[PDB]
Design a protein around this ligand. Structure first.
Ligand SMILES: *[C@@H]1O[C@H](CO)[C@@H](O[C@@H]2O[C@H](CO)[C@@H](O)[C@H](O)[C@H]2NC(C)=O)[C@H](O)[C@H]1NC(C)=O
Ligand SMILES: *[C@@H]1O[C@H](CO)[C@@H](O[C@@H]2O[C@H](CO)[C@@H](O)[C@H](O)[C@H]2NC(C)=O)[C@H](O)[C@H]1NC(C)=O
Lengths: 480, 480
């Protein structure tokens, strides 16, 4: 009942038993980590509870290289590990902390109770490492505010599924819950109310909680579209519409815009330790820009004609430059690439449009850019039945391209947009549907037996329920 | 923020205030009900909590006719009431208890807190009575066992939406959680486990809890199909398949079948006080019957040829006769009617097939039978977006027929089949999507303004959340 299925699993018929008040998880004497390592100490204690909640007396954990205990995970973090389950001492070995965390999760999935309640595990050897290194979940806290607690629960569920990126789509048109220190009015005027805000301390908590599970927090502050809530607190930022709404996208012709974005993104570069900031750039509407006289003036000032993609490109290029100047990487939705903006090498493009997405993957990778797939994994788009199967069956590298292009595919994200989701329904909708995406991104390409996937996923789902994650059923049945 | 919208609402701009520890709900001195009426006393206390959780000091409740306090509700129960909100004493008047319960719900939807927290209500007069008298929710506890607590919560939510029938699809192929006293082996061998069973006392609790909210409990013990779990404990009941599964539908050629069903339904007639028992009769597969030699013998014994609809009809007619002999009414899925079984007058046909359902309504009503619609309200069939709108827009009497035929349309049910539903996801999936069906069945035919429906339903949904029902959002937004 392993989920995701490890790279290599070799088991024996030899059963070993565990005694809850006589079973410890500890540092091997040769490890680079010790009691000082908060990350490993907290993991040891919480996995003790998950496991229990002929005798293997100890699970020794050996970190081989500089542990990276006090650091934040990044895209190249080594998550590989081996697990040797034997008597009297099992051994978890990993290059870094990140692999040990993954291995602790797998160890807990190997321990089970027999018919008489006896804690049991098979003698075994597991070798494991992920297929892709970007394995994300997108949450949307603008369409509905999500309390900190449900973000923490999602992070727990992500750890159980070996996801490593929380893509936090923190703000959007409807509300601005991010409390900015340098610009207090963004949240004061843009949030749904004062109890629908994320304080600097709420943000630190999510980041720390994520780090302890080897999860990166990738902030998205989408512009120039999806910014209506930004205009409540930052005057003169948004374009006024001469007529179909009242305000449109960010005004890209004003110097106050870029001065605001410089100061703002500098704050973001300090608050969020991850190397990458998602700049968005999706679904920019041009009707407002088209109907605005000052923008029309600006359009002819540098020969953009009637092609508003060039104005969008001009805006996005200035924002990409601001991110580069503060020494961070940028991630962008495909539109930015499709509308012919000039991107610096290293800029990650996220492919989300469901029409001809394999051909989009080819174009992006052929142009040299690293790529992330979300298109077929829009979990907000619910449907009747076992839709986990369609997410599972996706083979992400079935697009046209050389091996060099396929090496630019770094991973994917399962997206849960928030128009119809809040705390009342987020968890059942997210899990175990995202578990299908988690295996596809962790496990080998050839792991696709549907009967076996169903067998392991129902049991994994029951395990998520036992641990406090209200994951919905796959089909008729029961747990325990 | 009324939901469902009452028949007639007339309000004044005059505001009156309420004092929580100086506001009582009591029996008018001329009422037929008094302190002895448990049903009204418990409602008074729980609505006090819902309301609060120039001065109107009292809400007096007057029952005009024999109250029916100690009785179970039935199809012809009078749920009409008037509500006069004035100072110092408001008055709720109803023919029976059933109308007073509806009126208490409406009264609580009229009380609100202003910006400074002051409990306020407008002076007003409301006259109300339902458009249809059968207003049901179908729950399925076979595909997944639902704990008693979530059935009780659903009943609370139903009361808030003025639904009056719990259609309890208690058993099916996958499990038999109904503990039968006369046949203990049905649950002992057919349930998912011994903790996935409904004891006689669990059943009484649900019935009583329902009664206190004016809700009828309609049991469904579906036969001859949907009976695989029945065969674990009752040997020789199901037809053995000569080959695609192992067992098929109930064997209709054996006398032990009918002797079993007589004893069984007699137990059901005593356990469930409602006048009606749903016999099911949907999706009977003939391949097993066709492949069975003894059934082939039986088929020629009374000239049924190769038409297995006649054997199904023969079976169903014997079951309808058993129900008639114990003095109960029968409800049946449309297939029983479509396959030309002879139904006694009064037999209710439930139309569930989504293809040409208006024409099905015509055929059933033209033949003289009372009809219930579920076809367009299959809430298990989820989809992206505001699907509450499609359920709301259904106008049930848009079928071909005379006024006499339209008088045979007694109501409808919103169905939540259980293949993909259990305690982790039932509530968010059910509410407020079923609220759309509740208004369509309670309110006037001409109540269909979508903007107004959206305005009242978001607020109603926030009210359900405040009262402990985790109803999912309609669209982006927030509560409070
Ligand atoms: C883990 O060990 C158990 C116990 O030996 C294995 O289970 C049995 O396998 C043996 C030999 O294949 C069979 O004779 C038994 O019928 C199996 N069950 C029982 C009750 O002992 C199990 O296969 C092992 N796990 C793996 C994948 O190797
Ligand atoms: C309930 O009473 C309130 C208060 O009088 C009504 O609200 C106001 O209506 C008056 C006159 O139409 C307006 O001058 C106010 O602007 C309204 N609000 C306030 C703050 O007083 C409300 O309309 C009444 N409800 C109904 C449907 O009759």
């Amino acid at each position: 009942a392993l989920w995701p299925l490890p790279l290599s699993v070799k088991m024996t018929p030899n059963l070993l038993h565990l005694a809850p008040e006589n079973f410890y998880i500890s540092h091997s004497p040769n490890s680079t980590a010790g009691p000082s390592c908060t990350l490993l100490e907290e993991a040891f204690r919480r996995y003790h509870g998950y496991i229990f909640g002929t005798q293997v007396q100890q699970l020794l954990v050996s970190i081989t290289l500089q542990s990276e205990c006090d650091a934040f995970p990044n895209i190249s973090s080594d998550e590989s590990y081996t697990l040797l389950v034997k008597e009297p001492v099992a051994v978890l070995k990993a290059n870094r902390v990140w692999g040990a965390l993954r291995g602790l999760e797998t160890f807990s999935q190997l321990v089970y109770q027999d018919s008489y309640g006896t804690f049991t595990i098979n003698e075994s050897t597991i070798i494991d490492s992920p297929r892709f290194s970007h394995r994300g979940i997108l949450i949307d806290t603008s369409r509905h505010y999500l309390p900190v607690k449900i973000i923490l629960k999602t992070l727990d569920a992500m750890a159980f599924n070996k996801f490593n990126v929380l893509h936090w789509h923190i703000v959007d048109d409807q509300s601005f819950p991010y409390q900015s220190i340098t610009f207090p009015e963004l949240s004061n005027k843009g949030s749904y109310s004062l109890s629908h805000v994320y304080t600097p301390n709420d943000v630190r908590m999510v980041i720390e909680y994520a780090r302890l599970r080897g999860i990166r927090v990738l902030p998205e502050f989408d512009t120039p579209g999806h910014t209506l809530s930004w205009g409540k607190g930052q005057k003169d930022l948004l374009t006024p519409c001469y007529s179909l709404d009242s305000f449109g996208p960010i005004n890209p012709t004003l110097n106050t815009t870029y001065s605001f974005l410089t100061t703002f993104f500098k704050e973001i570069s300090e608050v969020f330790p991850d190397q990458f900031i998602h700049l968005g750039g999706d679904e920019v509407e041009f009707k407002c820009w088209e109907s605005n006289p000052k923008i029309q003036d600006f359009m002819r000032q540098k020969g953009f004609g009637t092609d508003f993609k060039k104005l969008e490109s001009f805006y996005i290029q200035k924002v990409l430059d601001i991110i580069a100047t503060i020494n961070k990487g940028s991630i962008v939705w495909q539109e930015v690439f499709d509308d012919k903006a000039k991107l610096a090498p290293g800029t990650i493009v996220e492919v989300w449009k469901d029409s001809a997405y394999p051909e989009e993957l080819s174009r992006v990778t052929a142009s040299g850019f690293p790529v992330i797939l979300s298109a077929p994994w829009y979990l907000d788009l619910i449907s009747y039945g076992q839709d986990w199967r369609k997410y599972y069956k996706v083979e992400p590298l079935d697009f046209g391209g050389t091996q060099k292009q396929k090496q630019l595919f770094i991973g994917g994200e399962a997206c849960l947009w928030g128009e119809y989701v809040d705390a009342t329904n987020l968890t059942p909708r997210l899990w175990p549907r995202a578990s299908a995406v988690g295996e596809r991104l962790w496990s080998s390409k050839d792991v696709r037996d549907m009967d076996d996937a169903y067998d392991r996923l129902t049991r994994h789902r029951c395990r998520m329920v036992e641990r406090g994650i209200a994951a919905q059923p796959l089909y008729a049945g029961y747990c325990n």
